[PDB]
Design an enzyme around this catalytic site. Structure first.
Site, PDB file in Angstrom:
ATOM      1  N   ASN A   1      61.526  20.488  35.618  1.00  0.00           N
ATOM      2  CA  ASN A   1      60.690  21.251  36.529  1.00  0.00           C
ATOM      3  C   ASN A   1      59.738  20.239  37.137  1.00  0.00           C
ATOM      4  O   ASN A   1      59.653  19.121  36.654  1.00  0.00           O
ATOM      5  CB  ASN A   1      59.889  22.339  35.806  1.00  0.00           C
ATOM      6  CG  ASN A   1      58.856  21.828  34.846  1.00  0.00           C
ATOM      7  OD1 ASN A   1      59.093  20.879  34.081  1.00  0.00           O
ATOM      8  ND2 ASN A   1      57.690  22.454  34.881  1.00  0.00           N
ATOM      9  N   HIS A  46      60.180  13.944  45.157  1.00  0.00           N
ATOM     10  CA  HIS A  46      60.777  13.765  43.836  1.00  0.00           C
ATOM     11  C   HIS A  46      60.416  12.460  43.139  1.00  0.00           C
ATOM     12  O   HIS A  46      60.547  11.377  43.712  1.00  0.00           O
ATOM     13  CB  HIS A  46      62.305  13.937  43.892  1.00  0.00           C
ATOM     14  CG  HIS A  46      62.700  15.357  44.167  1.00  0.00           C
ATOM     15  ND1 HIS A  46      63.135  16.193  43.149  1.00  0.00           N
ATOM     16  CD2 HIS A  46      62.606  16.071  45.310  1.00  0.00           C
ATOM     17  CE1 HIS A  46      63.346  17.374  43.721  1.00  0.00           C
ATOM     18  NE2 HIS A  46      63.072  17.342  45.018  1.00  0.00           N
TER      19      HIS A  46
END
Length: 197
Positions: A34, A45
């Site tokens: 998560n 990311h």
DNA sequence: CAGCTCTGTACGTGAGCGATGGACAGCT
DNA sequence: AGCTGTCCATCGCTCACGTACAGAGCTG
């Protein structure tokens, strides 16, 4: 008080989410657990300064140069790599997630993999594949191992490949060097698959 | 008993934030 | 010579998208 987020409260970050970076015909999909607080903050990311993801991608040769979180949108087009996470909710670590959240995440994830059908579904974290395996394949092994798994995503040719989480929180693989073996084997698996094509 | 799930706990590196204080220049 | 403030090297502490494993509590 220690300010790690340029005056943005932790409470605000906990309500933020991280967008998927998914397209069709990808070779690899990196599946995290998560978003952590830094990914929620940046909206990209693996931005964590100590996270091993970008360092391992370069050290393994999956990228020709050392990249960083701001390059995540270039990965499907340039390298054939996409991104998603098992659970949408942001938390400081994996230990804050409940069992129900993981199984809800698992059902959503198998649907996404059935839509995009990447050559390889990469679980960036052993814990999420343990839940995924019991939920999707109805299989629970005493000694779950890393690397290539013996089950394809149902109704697809997508393989399951497991690696220890790129988070520097896990003491068992203390450095990026200790995890790069799995990225090199991932690269070899990709090159072997493209070779048959 | 034996095997299973469940829960609490301990664990190695390396990076950013905040505190500390030595070097050092500017100014009298 | 003496004072004073900035710079910045360096230190200690906290943390990072977990993981393995003992041991308690069920259950066959």
């Amino acid at each position: 008080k220690v300010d790690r987020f340029n005056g943005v409260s932790e409470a605000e970050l906990l309500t933020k989410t991280l967008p998927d970076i998914l397209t069709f015909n990808l070779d690899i999909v990196i599946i995290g657990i998560n978003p952590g607080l830094m990914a929620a903050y940046k909206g990209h990311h693996y931005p964590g300064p100590g996270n091993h993801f970008w360092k391992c991608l370069f050290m393994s040769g999956l990228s020709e140069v050392q990249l960083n979180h701001m390059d995540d949108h270039t990965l499907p087009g340039k390298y054939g790599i996409g991104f998603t996470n098992m659970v949408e909710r942001t938390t400081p670590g994996s230990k804050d997630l409940s069992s129900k959240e993981f199984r809800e995440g698992g059902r959503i994830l198998v649907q996404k993999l059935q839509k995009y059908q990447p050559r390889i579904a990469v679980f960036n974290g052993k814990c999420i594949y343990e839940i995924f395996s019991k939920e999707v394949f109805g299989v629970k092994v005493k000694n779950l191992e890393f690397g290539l798994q013996p089950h394809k995503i149902p109704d697809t040719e997508t393989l399951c490949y497991v690696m220890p989480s790129s988070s520097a929180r896990c003491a068992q693989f203390p450095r990026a060097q200790d995890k790069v073996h799995y990225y090199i084997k991932l690269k070899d698996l990709r090159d072997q698959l493209k070779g048959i094509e």
